[PDB]
Scaffold this active site. Structure first.
Site, short mmCIF file in Angstrom:
data_model
loop_
_atom_site.label_atom_id
_atom_site.label_comp_id
_atom_site.label_asym_id
_atom_site.label_seq_id
_atom_site.Cartn_x
_atom_site.Cartn_y
_atom_site.Cartn_z
N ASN D 154 21.80 -12.75 3.75
CA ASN D 154 21.44 -11.33 3.88
C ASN D 154 20.66 -11.00 5.17
OD1 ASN D 154 19.15 -12.72 2.78
ND2 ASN D 154 18.26 -10.74 2.23
N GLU D 252 11.86 -19.65 -1.79
CA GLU D 252 11.76 -18.20 -1.92
C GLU D 252 13.04 -17.76 -2.62
OE1 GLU D 252 12.93 -14.69 0.34
OE2 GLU D 252 12.81 -14.67 -1.83
N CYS D 286 15.49 -9.51 -0.67
CA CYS D 286 14.74 -10.13 -1.75
C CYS D 286 13.58 -9.23 -2.21
CB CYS D 286 14.19 -11.49 -1.32
SG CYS D 286 13.11 -11.43 0.15
#
Ligand SMILES: NC(=O)c1ccc[n+]([C@@H]2O[C@H](COP(=O)([O-])OP(=O)(O)OC[C@H]3O[C@@H](n4cnc5c(N)ncnc54)[C@H](OP(=O)(O)O)[C@@H]3O)[C@@H](O)[C@H]2O)c1
Ligand SMILES: NC(=O)c1ccc[n+]([C@@H]2O[C@H](COP(=O)([O-])OP(=O)(O)OC[C@H]3O[C@@H](n4cnc5c(N)ncnc54)[C@H](OP(=O)(O)O)[C@@H]3O)[C@@H](O)[C@H]2O)c1
Lengths: 487, 484, 483, 489
Positions: D154, D252, D286
Site C-alpha cells: 500500500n 506492524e 493501516c
C-alpha cells in the site's frame, strides 16, 4: 578580499561601522597588510542586538526541521568556501597547512552535527505524584546569544558555538577576536549566502572591552558563550550578573600528559611532541606539562628532543609540510621570552630551542623544573614546555593536579589499573587514555573545571547551554482547597 | 532555648560567642537565642566540608542513598517538632506547615530514590578504535542559602538532592528562620552522616553568606531569595568561577477565561493568590480575567476573601492566614496599598493591619504603572485586571520582569495550549494553581526569576559536571614532524 | 502445607490434587504442594485481568509505597527464605545469604524507580503540533522461573513488573514451590490489592502453557532452558504477546599470561563452581593462555580439592551442596562419560552419591566435547589452552550461547579488544562471569535469549510507548481536490 | 523511465541478477491490467545467497564508525532526490496511487532517509552507578546482525525505506523482500542503494513469493531479526516461525482505527477531516479512519456533510492528471473482498448511504449507518473504501465502541474541550492517538506502532534503533577481593 571590503553583517546587510572607523589587519607571518577591517563601537553592537532580538520569535517558532534546513544550506556553502577559509586561517592566523586543513574538516563536521541534532532535542514526560495530572517538560531556546571567540582556532571554535546555538532556535550576535577578523567576516559571508532570515545572525568586528562588553551587559542578550583567557572570563561572568544572563566559559588549560614506565617510549615521544607543540602550543588543550616516570625518563627525554629537533618552522604559506608557523603577534613572543628567561634564571635546564625572530618562536624544552617556575604555574599558550620526572603514580597525580586549571589531561600506559586510577584522580573536565590531550569530537561535552571555566559545548551539550526546561501540567479534575477552611 | 551551629559533626557556639534573640512574628514573644556567626565560622564550616568531600564523593551511591533513607526515618520522627517551629517561628498556619512537612518527607525520599540512578552516556566515536564515554562527577562543596517563607521544604530540596550525588554542604538559613535550620542539623546529626558532610552556620547574609559565596573552596552556590540579592550573589560568585542556581521569586499571572466555572475559578484563585498570606514565589500575584465573566468572578472572589479567617496560627488547625514574617513586610504592603490608591485603584476589601497581621487587600481599576503590577508583591495585596480577549491576557501576563510560573483556567484545549505557549515563564499550569510543585520536576524560572532548575535529577544536573573520557586502542601516525 | 494465592486468597487447587516435595539433601519430606491445572491458571489470569485497570491507574508513588511495604516484610522474613533455599534448593549458607541480600536490593530497586520512568517530548516537523510519548503498562504479565536461584530471579521479575503497573501471574519451578509460596506470603502481608499478584503452583506443560497461550496475558517473562524458551516463544505468537527470555549460557572465562596466576585460579574456582556450577552465568568454559596454563591448572585443581562438599544445613562454611535432583547427576555423568571417551584427561572429581557430585575437571578437550558444545549446568568444567588472544576469542565464541563472559589481564589494550570481540550480552574485565546488579541490563544474545531485565530495562520489557499528538490549527486536505 | 532500457532483477552482493532458476512473473498495473515488467520469481536458493551475502558483509559494516554509515545514507538521500519522478511514476502505475498520494509518499521517504542519516552518530548507551566499590559499569549499543525486511503493497516505498534506512544506520545488514504486488518499487530502491555505492552484501533485494522467499528469511539461522508490515494473520505465522532460532521481530499488523467526533466540533471541518482520514488511498492505510464514531447531537448534520464530500470524490485513472482523488484498489481480490463487506452490511440491515458500485479494480466508497457490532465492517480490518458510521449518546459510549475491536494501532478525537479530549485519549486502547487531527498522522522520528492485534514494537528514528540493536553491559573491576569458596581459605 581583493574585490570586497571587510564589513559588519547586521540584520541581513553588510556595512561599515556607524563611525566609519577602521583598523589595518596584518599577517603575523611577515607583517604584510591583509585588509582594513571595522573598528566598531557600542552603537554597532546595540544595532546587532536589536536586530537579533527582533528576529528571535520567528526563528524560534518555526519547526526544528526548517532550522536544520538552513544549517544544511550553510554546510553546502561552507564546502564551497573551504579553500578561502584555509587561506585566511594561514595568512591571518599563522596556521600551517596541516593545522588549517584539520580545522576546516572539523568545522564541516561541526556544522553538519548541529544540523543533524536540531530535530532531535527532546524534553520529558513525567510520572505525576497526583491523580488526573499530565506532567511534561518542554525545551525552549534562551533567546539572543552573544558569541565571543579567540584567535587560535577562530573558525572551528566560532562555528561550534554559532551552528549549535542557531540550531535550537536562538539568534546570534558574534564578535570575533581582534586578531582574526577576516575569519569572522568569511563566516558572515557563508551565513549570508545560505540565506538565513535577517537578524538571525549578526557579525560585529571591534574591540573586546567595547563591543564585547556591550554584548555582555545588554538587557536583550539572554546568554553569552565565551572562549578566551581565564581573567577575561571572570570579568565577563561578573558583568553578566547584572541582567542575570547565563554564560558558557571555556578558559584555557594547563593539561598534564602523564607517561608511565610501561609505554612504548618512542611512540610516547612522538605522541608527546604532537600533543605539546601542534599549532605552536597555542591550543587550550595542548599538553602543556609533560610528566614522566623516572624508569623511562632518560630515554623519553632523549627521544622527545630528537623529534623536536626535526620540527620545521617556516612561512606556513611555503608548502604543505611546514610543521610550525609563527605566534599570533609580538606580545606573545615577548611573553614566551619571559617564560624562558624565568625558567633559566630559576635553574631550569634548557634542553633545546629558545630562538625567536619576528613573530616566530622555536620550541623551548625544559627539565630540572620545580613548582615555582612560571611555566608550571601559568597557562603557557605557546611552545615552551616543561618535562617533570616523577618517582611513582602518586607523584604523577600530585604534580598533574598542582595547577589552577582543569581542562583536559592524558595518560600513556598499557596497564588498565594504572590508567583508570590516574584518570579518576586527575582533576579535569576531560581525560584521554593513550591519546593526545587535545582530542575533540563535534558531539562530545567539551569543557573544564576549576579555572578552566564552566559548562560544556558540543552537540546536545551546546543545546543544554542555550535552552531551558519548561515544566507544563494539565489537571483534569477539580478539587477542594484548604482556604477558606469554613467551606 | 539555645541554638548552635553544626560544624564538622559538632554542635558549637560561634567562635565569638555572639548571639541574638529571636522573637515570634505572632506576638513578639521570645523563641530562642541563636548564633550571630562571623566569617571565621563560615570558613571553618567550609574547610570541614572540603576535608569531608573526597570520602563522601567516592563511596558508592547506594551508601549515600542509605544515609538519606536514614535521614528520612529520622525526619518522620520529627514531624510535629518541625510543624511547631514552622508555625511559631515562621507564622505559618497548621494547614500550611502540615503541607510543607508532608512535601519535605517526599523530597528527602526523592533524593534517596534517585541517588543510584543518575547516569552518564556512552557515545559513538567518529574515530576507529576509540571508546568514548561521559561520567557524572559531583561539583564539590556546595553553599546552600535559603529564604524564610518555606524554610523547611526549600532547604531540604536543596540539601537532600545536593548530598545525594556526592557533594558536601555548607548551609546558611534565613535570619528570620534560624531554628528551622537548627532542627535540620539535628535530623542530619541523628542520621549519623560523616562529620563535615553537612554543616550549618547561622549568621547574617552579608557576612556569613558573602563568605560562602566568595570562598575559593566552595564549588557551587544554590540560592533562593530576592532577585536583587541573587544578582549580587551571581556577581560575587564570578571571582572564583563558581556556578550558581538562583530562584528569585515571581509575579505569576493567573489567567481566567470566559468559559470557566466561575465559582470554582474564584475558589482556586483565592487559594493560589493568598495561601501563606501570598508569601510564595509562585503565588498567583496578578489575576487576569476575561471581560465576559469579570463582574461575576470579582464578586465571588471577594466573597471568598471575606470568608478567610486571620488569627494566631497556634490557636487551632483551621486558621486560614497567619501574620507576615515581620514589621518590614507590613510596611512594604502598606507602600503597595498607598501606591495603588494614589493611582486610582479601587480597594474592594482589606488593608487592615495590626502588629504583623494584614487582611488581604484586593484592588481593581488597576493599570500597568501600579507598583503591584510592576514588582513582586510578596504578601497579601492583589490586583485583578480585566482583559477583552486572549491576546490582551497574554500581553498583560508577559508585561513583567519576572517569569517563574503561571496558569490558565479554561475548558478550551486550543485556548489553553496557545496561552501556555505564549506566556513567558519557566513553569505553567492548565486548570490548576500557579504554585503546583512536585519533588522530581524541574522547578525554576526565566527572566528576573532566576537561572537553573531544582527537583530530582534537575537538582543533580545543577550540582554535578559531565566528564568526557576516552580510551584509544590503536596507535597512529601524527602530522608533526612531517619529515618523519 | 503450601497453597496457591489467587485474588487475595490462599487456596488449594480446584482438583484438590497435590504432590510431595522432598529435600535434595537426603530425600526427606519437605511439604505437600499443589498440583494445579488449567482452571487454576485461568482463575489467576482472570483475577489479574480484573485487577489491572485499578492498579495501572493509581499514581506511581502509590505502587512504590506498596513495594516499600513489601521490602519491610521481606526484611522480617529473611531467615525463613534462607532456610527454605537451603533445604528445598540445596543451597549453602553463603549462597542463600547472597541470594537474600540481593533480593532485598532488588525489591528496593523496583520501589526506587517506579516514580521515575519517563516518556519523551518530541520536536514536531509540523507547525502548531504538540508531540509526546507516554509509557503504558503492558497488562497481565506471566512470570515463569527456574530452580537454581528461585528467590532473586523471581523477585527481580515480579517486583519490577509490578512497579510500572502490570499485574502478575507467577508459576515457580516445580522443584522450588515453597520459595514461591513464601513470596506469596510476603506479598499478602504487604497488603497489595487482590488480583494484583497471583501464585499458581503446578507443572510447566500444564499451568505454564495456559499462561503462555491465554488471551488476557500480555507478556511472558521466562527464565529456563533454551529449548523451553523456544517452545514458549512459539506458543506466545498465537496471541501476539511479547516475551522476555533468559536461557542460560556457556560463558567463557579467559585468562591471559600477564595475570596473578594464584588470584586467577581462586577467581576461576569461585566463578566456575559456586552453587555447584548451577548458574546461568557460571564460568563454564575456562580458556587459558599457554604461558601460564601449567601453573594455572595446578593451582586451579589445588583449590578445587580444598572445596568442602557436605549437607548444606550442617554449618555456614560448606562450600558445595547437592545438585537439585537425580536427573542432574545423571546428566553430569553423561558429560563425564563423553569427555573420557573423546580423550579428555580427568584431573580430579567425578565421584557422586545421591544428589551430590564432586566437581570433575577436564583438560585435553576439543571443540567436539559435549562439555564444550552444550550448557553444562552443574560441576563439570573443561579447561582449554590457547596460544594467543585470537585463539582465545575464537574458542570463546565457538558456542551457540552468548550470555556473559570475562577476561583476566592487566593489559588495557588486550582487555578491551577481547571484550569487544567476544559475542555476549554481558562482559566483565577482571571479575567473575556472574556479576549482577539490581539495575543493570541483564540478558544474552544468540541461544541465551532475548530482552534485558534489571531496573529500567525491566520497565522497557513490560511497558509500551504511546505517541500522542495535539494539533492546534485547522488545515486544508488534499481530497476532494475540487474543493 | 520506460516500462517496456525495464530489466528488473534481484540485487545480491552488489550485483543485479536473475533468480537461480530463471523463473519470472509479469507485473501488471491495477489500473488497466497493462504489463509493467517481467520480474523475478525467486526461490529459497536466492534467499539463502542474499542472507549469506549479508552475513559475510556484517562485521565490516558494523565495525566502521557510525559517521561512515551516515555518509552512505546521505549519499542514498542524494540519489533518491534524483530519482523522485521515477519513484512517483512507479508508485502510481504499479501501486494505483494518485499523484497526491505518491508525491506525499516520496516527500516522506526523503525525510525518512535523511532522518536515519541524522541519527546514526547519536545513538547512545549509558554510564551507570555501580553498587560495588572500584567498579566501572557501562552499557554499549550493538547491532543485531542480519535483518530481514518484509513489506506490504500500500505504501511500499515509505514503509520499506523507514525499515531499510534506520536498520542500516545502526550497523545491521539487510535482506529485503518487497510485496509481490509492488516489485518494481523494491527494484528502484536497490537501484538507489547501488548508485550510492554501499559495500557489497550490506543491502540485498530478493523478489519472490512470501511463503517461499519470505519464509526462508524468517527461518534462516543467520538472520537475527525480522521487521514486517502486513496482515495480522501473516504476522502471527512469522512470529511463530521466528521462534525456532530465537530471532526477534517487529510487527506492524494493520488497524481498525476509531475516529471519534464530539458534539462541540466545527461539523463541516470534522466532515472534511473524516473524508480525508477514512478514504485517502482508497482507505488502504493501516491507520485509516476505519470506524467513524459520532455524537448524536451532531450526527445528522455530520452524516449529511460527510456524504456530501464523499460524493465529490473524483475516481479515475491516477495517471490521468494531478487532481484525481481516488485510484483503483491493488487487485481484483481486493475488490471482491470489499464486495463481501458491502453485501454483509446490506444483508444485516445496514443503511447504505452512498456508493458500493465497482468497475474493474476501481471501488466506489460505500458508506453505512445503522450498523451493529456483528457487522464484518466492525469486526474486521477493512483495508478498502467501505466505512461504517456509528452514532453514540455520550463519551462513555464513544470509548466503548472505539475499544470494541481486536485491533489497536491509532485513533483520533475531534473536540475543543480539553477534558473530554484527554479523557478519551487516555481511555482508547491504541499504540498512537491524535487529538484534532487525522488517524494516520506519521512523522519520521516518532514511535509508530500498535497494541493488541496491531502488532509489537515501534519504528521511526531512535525507536527503529531500539528494535535492531541490543544493550551490552560491560564492567571493569579495579580491585582484587576474596571469594567465599573454598571457605577454608
Ligand atoms: C536457566 O535455567 C535453566 C535451568 O532451569 P530449569 O530446569 O528450571 O529450566 P526449565 O526446564 O526450562 O524450566 C523453567 C520453568 O519453565 C517451566 N516450564 C517447563 N515447560 C514449560 C512449558 N511447556 N510452558 C511453560 N513453562 C514451562 C518450568 O516448570 P516445571 O518446573 O513444572 O517444569 C519452570 O517453571 C538453565 O538453562 C539456566 O541457564
Ligand atoms: C497492513 O498491510 C496489510 C496488507 O498488506 P499485505 O497484503 O502485503 O499483507 P501480507 O499478505 O501479510 O503480506 C506482507 C508481506 O509478507 C509477505 N508474506 C506473505 N506470507 C509470508 C510468509 N509466510 N512469510 C514471510 N512473508 C510472507 C508478503 O509477500 P507476498 O506478497 O509475496 O505474499 C508480503 O511481502 C493490511 O492488511 C494491513 O494489515
Amino acid at each position: 578580499l581583493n574585490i570586497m571590503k571587510v564589513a559588519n553583517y547586521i540584520n541581513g546587510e553588510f556595512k561599515e561601522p556607524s563611525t566609519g572607523a577602521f583598523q589595518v589587519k596584518t599577517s603575523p607571518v611577515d607583517g604584510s597588510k591583509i585588509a582594513e577591517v571595522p573598528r566598531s563601537g557600542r552603537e554597532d553592537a546595540r544595532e546587532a542586538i536589536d536586530s537579533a532580538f527582533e528576529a528571535l520569535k520567528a526563528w524560534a517558532n518555526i519547526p526544528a526541521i526548517r532550522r536544520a534546513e538552513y544549517l544544511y544550506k550553510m554546510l553546502e556553502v561552507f564546502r564551497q568556501m573551504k579553500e578561502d577559509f584555509m587561506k585566511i586561517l594561514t595568512v591571518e592566523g599563522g596556521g600551517t597547512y596541516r593545522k588549517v586543513w584539520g580545522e576546516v574538516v572539523f568545522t564541516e563536521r561541526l556544522i553538519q552535527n548541529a544540523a543533524e541534532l536540531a530535530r532531535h532535542y527532546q524534553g520529558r514526560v513525567l510520572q505525576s505524584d497526583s491523580e488526573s495530572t499530565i506532567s511534561v517538560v518542554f525545551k525552549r531556546s534562551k533567546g539572543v546569544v552573544g558569541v565571543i571567540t579567540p584567535w587560535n582556532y577562530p573558525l572551528s571554535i566560532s562555528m561550534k558555538k554559532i551552528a549549535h546555538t542557531l540550531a535550537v532556535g536562538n539568534t546570534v550576535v558574534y564578535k570575533p577576536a581582534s586578531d582574526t577578523p577576516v575569519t569572522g567576516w568569511l563566516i558572515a559571508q557563508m551565513v549570508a549566502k545560505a540565506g538565513l532570515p535577517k537578524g538571525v545572525f549578526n557579525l560585529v568586528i571591534g574591540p573586546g572591552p567595547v563591543v564585547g562588553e556591550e554584548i555582555v551587559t545588554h538587557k536583550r542578550v539572554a546568554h553569552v558563550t565565551f572562549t578566551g583567557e581565564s581573567s577575561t572570563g571572570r570579568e565577563i561572568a561578573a558583568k553578566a550578573a547584572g541582567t542575570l544572563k547565563t554564560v558558557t566559559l571555556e578558559l584555557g588549560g594547563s593539561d598534564p600528559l602523564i607517561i608511565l614506565d610501561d609505554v612504548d617510549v618512542d611512540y610516547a615521544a612522538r605522541l608527546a611532541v604532537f600533543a605539546s607543540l601542534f599549532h605552536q602550543g597555542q591550543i587550550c588543550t595542548s599538553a602543556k606539562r609533560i610528566i614522566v616516570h623516572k624508569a623511562v625518563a632518560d630515554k623519553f627525554i632523549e627521544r622527545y628532543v630528537h623529534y623536536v629537533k626535526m620540527l620545521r618552522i617556516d612561512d606556513p604559506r611555503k608548502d604543505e609540510k611546514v610543521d610550525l608557523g609563527p605566534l599570533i603577534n609580538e606580545r606573545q613572543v615577548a611573553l614566551m621570552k619571559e617564560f624562558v628567561d624565568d625558567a633559566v634564571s630559576r635553574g631550569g635546564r634548557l634542553l633545546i630551542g629558545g630562538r625567536s625572530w619576528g613573530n616566530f618562536f622555536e620550541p623551548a624544552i625544559f627539565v630540572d623544573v620545580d613548582r615555582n617556575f612560571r611555566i608550571m604555574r601559568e597557562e603557557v599558550f605557546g611552545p615552551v614546555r616543561p618535562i617533570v620526572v616523577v618517582e611513582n603514580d602518586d607523584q604523577a597525580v600530585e604534580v598533574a593536579n598542582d595547577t589552577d586549571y582543569g581542562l583536559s589531561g592524558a595518560v600513556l600506559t598499557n596497564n588498565v589499573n594504572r590508567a583508570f586510577r590516574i584518570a579518576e584522580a586527575v582533576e579535569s573536565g576531560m581525560f584521554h587514555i593513550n591519546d593526545v590531550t587535545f582530542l575533540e569530537e563535534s558531539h562530545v561535552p567539551f569543557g573544564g573545571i576549576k579555572a578552566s571555566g564552566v559548562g560544556r559545548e558540543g552537540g546536545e551539550w551546546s543545546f543544554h547551554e542555550t535552552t531551558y526546561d519548561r515544566w507544563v501540567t494539565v489537571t483534569l479534575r477539580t478539587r477542594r482547597f484548604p482556604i477558606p477552611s469554613a467551606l
